[PDB]
Write a protein that binds this ligand. Sequence first.
Ligand code: GLU
Length: 258
Amino acid sequence: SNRSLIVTTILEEPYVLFKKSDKPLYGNDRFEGYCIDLLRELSTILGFTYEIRLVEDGKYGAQDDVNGQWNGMVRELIDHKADLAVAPLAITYVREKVIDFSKPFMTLGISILYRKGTPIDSADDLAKQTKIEYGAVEDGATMTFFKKSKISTYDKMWAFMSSRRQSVLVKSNEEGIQRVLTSDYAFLMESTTIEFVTQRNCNLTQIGGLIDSKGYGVGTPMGSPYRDKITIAILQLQEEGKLHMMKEKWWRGNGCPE
Ligand SMILES: N[C@@H](CCC(=O)O)C(=O)O
């Protein structure tokens, strides 16, 4: 009996969410989304069975300053609590040092989610003031970007977020959106997710362009034999246009003027 691979992931629309149904759903059947469709394709292409498990601490993954320990999906892979991480997991150098990533299946960049009708046009507009608050998902790649950046504007922004951790860093992208809707707050979030949000909530918009550039990749414990096999599978899916169709399927946001 070939054991099923344990796949860690995280709730994040439209990548992974609880499928609605009139009757209860169990195990893998509970989930749907872009990353779920991606996982399904990987399993058939490589030929493996799996069991989906939501990351226990509900985090993507960041390293602690004192003990140097990681958390989130990154940590679950490091400790071999999961064979693969199939989620909107940003491929970053600091993460590549502890886990491996497949080639990216989607590209993106950090940008700003805010309301319409304001003169704000860039991160610089946010950095020079403190009336409009701003933050990012705690223990995620965006937070880490600002935490280590030496770029003047971003260093200042991290100084702002750091002293206000408990009030501006959020538990999820969903909460970040809620902050934008319930206070004078601008949220630093990935462009792909901003695209999804703004096509569904016409009160919101992206401010400025992409602050950086990265991709999402499937994560595996360092040294895993599946990493290269998954990379090939992703390139195949890309070539035949399936990744494109999958994006269109889940980002279906025929709403909000642009
Ligand atoms: N996708 C990000 C989480 C969200 C964010 O940091 O903006 C990550 O892999 O950590």
